[PDB]
């Protein structure tokens, strides 16, 4: 394979100052004419001029109106257009090309493509080169003048980045519109849209300069009523960036557009953000609760990119985390502020410690700033995004709010209108750090290892108390496992947010403090500690690490009950469950391997179960928090602690634990399920698409979690409750009725009822597909075959493909069937999908990431499917790189 290395970055020998496009959309072809006003840079050494250009049909090429000819002045191999250096001018010049492309057949959803009846672009990372020739890299910044023409009847709305400066009629029923984007930008931020779109709009007045900005949100006609919450969340995002960061929007207009066919969530094209319809469109009658959270976060995310990615952009793709990690952090701060519930931060932690930690212990492990790539697309990872966000968040933890805001402002101002690197950000933070410490010798040089060093640190603790001296010490060690990226690991700068809880009364003993661990180990000593404490460690999840608290289950129970920090409470509960899981897992595993006729299991701690009941029954405790405590840790979290994992033994483990707890708590669970009904399903705001009560949503989450527990338990007469729940006006409730009915004969009747309620809304049908796919059904393989034949069919919509298959892959017992038939099925779907959408094909590989953690028979089966995929002729470079890295071949 063809490998790019971070160390080999060099500025181009060329400059592209202005781009002038004419994009003429016809029924069976789109013609792109482009003039690049170019120059020679200070770095030029008389090299050939090489443009990226993939799958383009050339009509004409010229320089300064001189036609250039293939074989004589240029070559083109379907990937790169080479102009021989003799024909490259030595000062300012105009490069012209006209090419033909075919959006109607572009099923990879990169470049210019057709989504239902909308023509739309996606250029990040390497898609602009599929539209026209460019030096397609983020340091090549230019200004854009864009004309789009099309049939007026078919495509009455035409959008590109920036100010619409003209609109005109064209003979033969066509029309045009011209856009001028005054902000310099890399080509990955170019966008165009053409369709029969409807919109909602509002005017926003900026807080400091009082600029009027027109906000438009667009969709196809059928779903225009599903746009309101998106528009509200944009207003919220604009206000937050003003209020926290002092940042105002910088154009007269901002458009958000929903399209049905999209590879990921959304894209931050300047003044023209394009979204997966699943991350922009909702209505309370036709969307599950989690849609509202998703839309809020994705609209926020794309909005926050306007500074962290757009106004300050990337020097090169190795810097991706500078924009994504930072924008995820911004989005997470925003989400926490808007939702005002502790479950928000917990959900982010849960995602990191399950999905991102698994990736970091896998053969795909990379630092948040990678050293190399074949296909840059494979580096849009949970590591880059979510671990990057936690690295971006640690600066806030270390600095505090005032000095964090100072450093961020230094960064955003110094680098405005330009490219930047991870170092520039660390430098700005270091300036703030020097001011905070009042010491111009302080530095964050060590901090850079968070960018360069892969893997998750393990942080462990020992404690000692001296009652005569009233003195307490916390001794801390960090360790990062060696891996293929560094054979020797270095200690990081780990900030440890701590409190100390009095076990006697459950109250705080110190002002919260942030310990700055910089060595491989250190002991932190506290005076005037009047009794032996229980430490409250890594409050807020203050660094992205494995925590070994070295606490007894009794001490963990006391934190779960009485500590003030939601993460530490949650983590204490997590740790009690993990100890029990590992113990019971080993018990079942030994009995299976030894063919024992009889053996013991360690029961669940009875004092823990009493604590869960105390929490659940406390009407003033948090409903979203309650849903986390009654749930075991996610399977992908658990698998980070087990080697050679027998998935069926784990499935048996989890069932034993759940049954133990339900045998004590099911009556409490029932009583709560009923008591919660009035407040949970209250219809206040049911007609208001501008407001969501997140606490009330968490109450529904808790009710549906309890209902799942009680349904799996066959609690007496619970089928009645399930039938009543299916008549709720909330889709979150009536789709839950479907999956919980899996344990009863009523399953197929509820399957039909909910299908009928879902089938006329594209996005609701997808939620129905997921609900079926994750259903705990012994006949799930036959249900999947029915979904394929009756609903999915030959759809190329990534949302449909992902809906049908990904939830099923989380079915621990059935996806991991010892025959390998799960593995075979998903490998077939990956190979099928790779023939038209390589990016979605790599997304569908996600279940294979843990292959080398499994028992040796399941390792072998997975490995055989991965090698079969790798032998597929015409495998994409995306899928081939991914799979070669994953199987330790690259
Ligand atoms: C929606 C998320 C998951 C990602 C989104 N990024 C993109 O739309 N990037 C283009 C892309 C995504 C995934 C894999 C490859 C590529 Cl090039 C983003 O960061 N938008 O701001
Ligand atoms: Mg082509
Ligand atoms: Mg997010
Ligand atoms: Mg469809
Ligand atoms: Zn992003």
UniProtKB/Swiss-Prot annotation:
Q: Spell out the catalytic residues.
A: 302
Kindly list the residues the record flags as site (Important for substrate specificity).
264
Q: What processing steps or modifications follow its translation?
A: The full length protein appears to be cleaved into a 120 kDa precursor. This precursor is then proteolytically cleaved at the N-terminus generating a 96 kDa form which is further processed at the C-terminus into 68 kDa and 35 kDa forms that remain associated.
Q: Where in the cell is it found?
A: Cytoplasm
Q: What class of enzyme is it?
A: hydrolase
**GO BP field:** proteolysis
Q: Which GO terms describe its molecular function?
A: aminopeptidase activity; dipeptidase activity; metalloaminopeptidase activity; zinc ion binding
Cofactor stoichiometry and binding remark = Binds 1 zinc ion per subunit. Also, can use Mn(2+), Mg(2+) and Co(2+) with less efficiency.
UniProt site (Cleavage): 600-601
Q: How is its activity regulated?
A: Inhibited by 1,10-phenanthroline, EDTA and bestatin. Inhibited by (Benzyl)Tyr-Ala (BTA). Activity is not affected by phosphoramidin, PMSF, leupeptin, iodoacetamide or pepstatin.
Q: How does activity depend on pH?
A: Optimum pH is 7-7.5. Active from pH 5 to 9. Has less than 20% of normal activity at pH 6.0.
List the GO terms this entry assigns under cellular component, sorted alphabetically: cytoplasm; food vacuole; membrane; nucleus; symbiont-containing vacuole membrane; vacuolar lumen
Residues given in the record as Zn(2+) binding sites: 301, 305, 324
Q: Which UniProt keywords apply?
A: Aminopeptidase, Cytoplasm, Dipeptidase, Hydrolase, Membrane, Metal-binding, Metalloprotease, Nucleus, Protease, Signal, Vacuole, Zinc
Cofactor(s) this protein cannot do without: Zn(2+)
Major location category of this protein: cytoplasm
Q: What is its EC number?
A: 3.4.11.-
Return the annotated site residues (Transition state stabilizer).
385
Family affiliation: Belongs to the peptidase M1 family.
This protein's assembly is summarised as: Heterodimer of the p68 form and the p35 form which are derived from the p120 precursor.
List other remarks: May have an additional translation initiation. Translation initiation at the first Met codon would generate a form that contains the signal peptide, enters the endomembrane system, and ultimately reaches the food vacuole. Initiation of translation at an internal Met codon would result in a form that lacks the signal peptide, thereby re-directing the protein to the cytosol. A nuclear localization signal would then lead to nuclear import.
**Function according to Swiss-Prot or TrEMBL:** Displays aminopeptidase activity with a broad substrate specificity. Preferentially, cleaves after Leu and Met, but also cleaves after Ala and Arg. Low activity towards Lys, Phe, Tyr, Trp, Gln, Ser and Gly and negligible activity towards Glu, Asp, Pro, Ile, Thr, Val, His and Asn. Has dipeptidase activity. Plays a role in the terminal stages of host hemoglobin digestion by cleaving the N-terminal residue of small hemoglobin-derived oligopeptides.
What is the protein's name according to its record? Aminopeptidase N
Q: Name the gene for this chain.
A: M1AAP
Query: From the entire protein, which fragment is shown?
Result: 196 to 1085 of 1085
């Amino acid at each position: 394979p063809k490998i790019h290395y971070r160390k080999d970055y060099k500025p181009s020998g060329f400059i592209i100052n202005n781009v002038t496009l004419n994009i003429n959309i016809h029924d069976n072809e789109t013609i792109v004419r482009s003039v690049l006003d170019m120059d020679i840079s200070k770095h030029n050494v008389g090299e050939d001029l090489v443009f990226d250009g993939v799958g383009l049909k050339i009509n004409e090429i010229s320089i300064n109106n001189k036609k250039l000819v293939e074989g004589e002045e240029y070559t083109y191999d379907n990937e790169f257009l080479t102009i021989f250096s003799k024909f490259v001018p030595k000062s300012k010049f105009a490069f012209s090309s006209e090419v033909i492309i075919h959006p109607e057949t572009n099923y990879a959803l990169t470049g210019l493509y057709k989504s239902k009846n909308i023509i739309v672009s996606q250029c990040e990372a390497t898609g602009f080169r599929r539209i026209t020739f460019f030096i397609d890299r983020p340091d090549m910044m230019a200004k854009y003048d864009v004309t789009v023409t099309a049939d007026k009847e078919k495509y009455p709305v035409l959008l590109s980045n920036g100010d619409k400066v003209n609109e005109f009629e064209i003979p033969g029923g066509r029309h045009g519109a011209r856009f001028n984007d005054p902000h310099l930008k890399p080509c990955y931020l170019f966008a165009v849209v053409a369709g029969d779109l409807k919109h909602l709009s509002a005017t926003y007045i900026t807080k400091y300069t009082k600029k009027k900005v027109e906000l438009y949100v667009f969709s196809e006609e059928k779903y225009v009523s599903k746009l309101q919450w998106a528009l509200e969340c944009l207003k919220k995002s604009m206000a937050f960036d003003e209020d926290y960061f002092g940042l105002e929007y910088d154009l007269s207009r901002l458009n958000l557009v929903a399209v049905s066919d999209f590879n990921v969530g959304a894209m931050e094209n300047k003044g023209l953000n394009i979204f997966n319809a699943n991350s922009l469109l909702a209505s309370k009658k036709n969307s599950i609760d989690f849609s509202y959270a998703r839309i809020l976060t994705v609209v926020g995310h794309e909005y926050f990119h306007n500074y962290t990615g757009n106004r300050v952009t990337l020097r090169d793709w190795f810097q991706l985390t500078l924009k994504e990690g930072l924008t995820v952090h911004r989005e997470n701060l925003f989400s926490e502020e808007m939702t005002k519930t502790v479950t928000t931060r917990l959900s982010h932690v849960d995602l990191l410690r399950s999905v991102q930690f698994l990736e970091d212990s896998s053969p795909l492990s990379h630092p948040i700033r990678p050293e190399s790539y074949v296909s840059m697309e494979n580096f849009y990872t949970t590591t880059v995004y979510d671990k990057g966000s936690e690295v971006m968040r640690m600066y806030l933890t270390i600095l505090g709010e005032e000095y964090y805001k100072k450093g961020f402002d230094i960064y955003i101002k110094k680098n405005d209108g330009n490219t930047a690197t991870c170092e520039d950000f660390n430098y700005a933070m270091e300036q703030a750090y020097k001011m905070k410490k009042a010491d111009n010798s302080a530095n964050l040089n060590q901090y850079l290892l968070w960018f360069s060093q892969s893997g998750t640190p393990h942080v462990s603790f020992k404690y000692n108390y001296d009652a005569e001296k009233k003195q307490y010490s916390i001794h801390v060690n960090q360790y990062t496992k060696p891996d293929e990226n560094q054979k020797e690991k270095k200690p990081l700068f780990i900030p440890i947010s701590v409190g100390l809880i009095n076990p006697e009364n459950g109250k705080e003993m110190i002002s919260q403090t942030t310990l700055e661990l910089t060595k491989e180990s250190d002991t932190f000593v506290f005076n005037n500690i009047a009794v032996k404490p229980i430490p409250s460690l890594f409050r807020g999840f203050s660094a992205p690490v494995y925590i070994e608290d070295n606490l007894t289950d009794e001490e963990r129970i006391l934190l779960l009950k009485y500590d003030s920090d939601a993460f530490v409470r949650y983590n204490s509960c997590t740790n009690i469950y993990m100890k029990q899981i590992l113990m019971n897992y080993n018990e079942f595993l030994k009995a299976k391997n030894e063919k024992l006729e009889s053996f013991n299991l360690t029961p669940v701690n009875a004092q823990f179960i009493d604590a869960i009941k105390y929490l659940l029954e406390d009407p003033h405790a948090d409903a979203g928090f309650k849903s986390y405590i009654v749930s075991l840790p996610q399977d992908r979290y658990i698998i980070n602690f087990v080697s050679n994992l027998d998935t069926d033994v784990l499935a048996d483990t989890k069932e034993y634990i759940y049954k133990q707890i339900g045998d004590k708590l099911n009556d409490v669970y029932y009583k709560m399920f009923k008591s919660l009904e009035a407040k949970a399903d209250d219809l206040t705001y049911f007609n208001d698409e501008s407001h969501v009560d997140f606490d009330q949503m968490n109450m529904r989450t808790l009710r549906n979690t309890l209902l799942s527990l009680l349904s799996k338990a066959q609690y007496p007469n619970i089928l009645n409750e399930i039938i009543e729940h299916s008549k709720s006006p909330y889709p979150s409730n009536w789709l839950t009725s479907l999956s919980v009915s899996a344990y009863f004969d009523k399953y197929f009747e509820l399957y039909d009822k909910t299908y009928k309620l879902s089938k006329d809304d594209e996005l609701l049908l997808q939620e129905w597909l997921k609900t079926v796919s994750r259903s705990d059904r012994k006949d799930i393989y036959e249900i999947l075959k029915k979904l394929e034949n009756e609903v999915l069919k030959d759809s190329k919509n990534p949302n449909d493909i992902r809906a049908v298959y990904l939830p099923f892959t989380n079915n621990l017992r059935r996806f991991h069937d010892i025959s390998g038939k799960g593995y075979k099925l998903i490998a077939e779907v990956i190979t099928k999908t790779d023939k038209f959408n390589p990016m979605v094909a790599t997304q569908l590989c996600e279940p294979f990431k843990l292959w080398n953690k499994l028992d040796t028979k399941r390792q072998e089966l997975m490995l055989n499917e991965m090698n079969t995929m790798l032998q597929e002729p015409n495998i994409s470079n995306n899928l081939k790189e991914y799979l070669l890295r994953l199987t330790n071949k690259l």
